[PDB]
Amino acid sequence: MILDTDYITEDGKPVIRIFKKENGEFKIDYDRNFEPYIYALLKDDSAIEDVKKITAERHGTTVRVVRAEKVKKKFLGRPIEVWKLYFTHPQDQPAIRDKIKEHPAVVDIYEYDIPFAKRYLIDKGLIPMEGDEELKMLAFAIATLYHEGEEFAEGPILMISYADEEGARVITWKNIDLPYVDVVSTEKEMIKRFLKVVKEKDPDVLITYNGDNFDFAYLKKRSEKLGVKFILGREGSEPKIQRMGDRFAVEVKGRIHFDLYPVIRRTINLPTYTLEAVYEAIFGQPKEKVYAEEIAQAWETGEGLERVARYSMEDAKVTYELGKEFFPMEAQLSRLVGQSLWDVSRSSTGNLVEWFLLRKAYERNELAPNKPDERELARRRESYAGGYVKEPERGLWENIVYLDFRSLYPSIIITHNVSPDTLNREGCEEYDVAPQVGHKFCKDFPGFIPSLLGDLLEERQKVKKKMKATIDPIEKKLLDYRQRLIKILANSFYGYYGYAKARWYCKECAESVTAWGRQYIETTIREIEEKFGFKVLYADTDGFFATIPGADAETVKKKAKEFLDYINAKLPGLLELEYEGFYKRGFFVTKKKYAVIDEEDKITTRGLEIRRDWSEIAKETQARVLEAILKHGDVEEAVRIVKEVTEKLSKYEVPPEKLVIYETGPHVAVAKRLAARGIKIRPGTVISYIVLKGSGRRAIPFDEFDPAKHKYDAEYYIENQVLPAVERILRAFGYRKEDLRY
């Protein structure tokens, strides 16, 4: 299988390198005959002789057009004849493209900024990560000596840990009596020892957590300080550092540097992205953090080195475990988009769609439009208006069904052939007109994007069938990832239409999809109201909550199934309405804010106060109010609960344990008290404090709370904690803040 591609320059000529892993053997293939090229649209074919003589300079050397050939391509559905201009080296293109564009007879130039190694994969039809080759992986982490006020990598590397199927080990230059610790004489010997393990193990994948912006940079500066050739690459190279906007990225030639940090940053949403928080969210198991001060103290005193070595071992162990969990998904994403795992794991949704489109465009002889210039880019940042949101019916409702469209936006794009190449195509015999906006889309031929989107949905179904039929659990997980990634790619096309940097950007397409979506949801609502007697309580973009106010639970379910059969027969093409849940009770506060409860008595919420500055009394009272309303149907009881809680708080009857806040006023006051005890100020959600009557404008750690010495601030927990947490819920029922505080 293909791992990656790149190029080196030898005597001014580019040489493509294909890094492969075939039958348990690493291989490098070379291609010295791939010519870089760009396209040029001319007003007259006679002008080609003027374009051939256009020259520029790279580094003293004169860059010129090697040869040209006239080709026939499609450009936004219309046939076009352009000149394919060949060059000696890919770096000739940035040097001459402006001089060719500025030529009067040149209407425009195309495909002039496509990286050579990526252009090779597309043009040769090569797909990375394809096949059943098993890759060898190795995770690693480092521990450093930190001092506040010193330059980057001023202190030495204390330990280097690594982990794989054989387990986790720690290399260090101090005596540690642990079975998994290997002891060397110096920091230099430790780094050299790590090089030998990577060389002997010869892993295809090097797994790190934030290795792009820390680990590799630290190792690089230390190896320069110690005079070590840090040869991690399979061809004898040192790790290559690249610039990715405001941050960095590291390649290790011949292998795949898989940095888990950007991957997990996109996949899951967490308050903090420390290695400890991430591991605990994915595996549900705890991981203790050992801070830089504790590491430095242990190394200088020589006391407690077992604890630091165990932490270093766990870092490598959990990084290998997380790498085993996220790599197969990224390998499937690489197969899907057609680019290396290295690029795919570090790219955004917009870039992933573009690279998929660029490959498909080449396959279909479709000339790709250019990226927007700075002027055009500013023109594409205009406001938006898409998605219907109904203002909800106020009050408590019973026996509610939730109905929604299956893939509304992709269905619209396919059904109505929405594409920049079908938009207002003159002489069209058949067309669909977008409501309100009035954009017409030709139906005479399949549009580029709807055609690909249709093939994606067909491929997804073929993948789902294979998944359900395969007994092999590893293959089932792989098919599951591919299937899920196809769904995500299909649901990225709408957003891509309105994506300012997109080559195939089309605001008319984007507005048309939302206008059609507004029409389908609004027509379905009036249909269920007029012909089935349902009341639509709330609706947002592709679904709605409905009920028959005086009907029982089985009656509402039956009528909903009958409505689905009715409207699905009327819906065109791929559009389909679905039954996605029944709820015993529910209330809809405002747009995007509501709460509902299923038959299993499970409360589902959206748009509630549930920030980091919150106590167990505020969380408990909100749950109690929600339960009284949704489970008992008693809104007056929910009010009495708040009145009871505020009265108990004012009379000091609430236990202090329910007043602890876990995390500017209280926070800075508690920070001073914690720093006074030797505890360093570190970013973490571990601060547990309680607010006292401080008579200032007051916070102490909960461990030090004593009822005989301290009295909590009842007014603070009423006005800043309990009331704000329940206020939005009870304001929907007509109650003000003052109607609850006794």
Author numbering: 1 to 610, 612 to 664, 676 to 709, 713 to 757
Quote the paper.
Variants of the archaeal polymerase from Thermococcus gorgonarius, TgoT, that can either generate HNA from DNA (TgoT_6G12) or DNA from HNA (TgoT_RT521) have been previously identified. Consistent with all other DNAPs from B-family, TgoT and its variants fold into five distinct structural subdomains.
In particular, the compartmentalized self-tagging (CST) strategy enabled the discovery of polymerases capable of processive HNA synthesis. This approach was performed on libraries of mutants of a variant of the replicative B-family DNAP, which was isolated from the archaeal hyperthermophilic Thermococcus gorgonarius (Tgo). To better understand how the mutations added on TgoT variants impact the structure of the polymerase, the X-ray structures of the apo form of TgoT, replicative polymerase TgoT_6G12, and reverse transcriptase TgoT_RT521 were solved by crystallography. Crystals were obtained for the three polymerases and diffracted at 2.4, 3.1, and 2.35 Å, respectively. Hence, overall, the crystal structure of the wild-type TgoT appears more stable than the two variants studied here. Nevertheless, both structures are in the known and expected “open” conformation. The presence of this antechamber, which is reminiscent of a storage pocket, was actually observed in two other structures, namely the apo-structure of TgoT and the binary structure of TgoT_6G12, all grown in an excess of ddNTP.
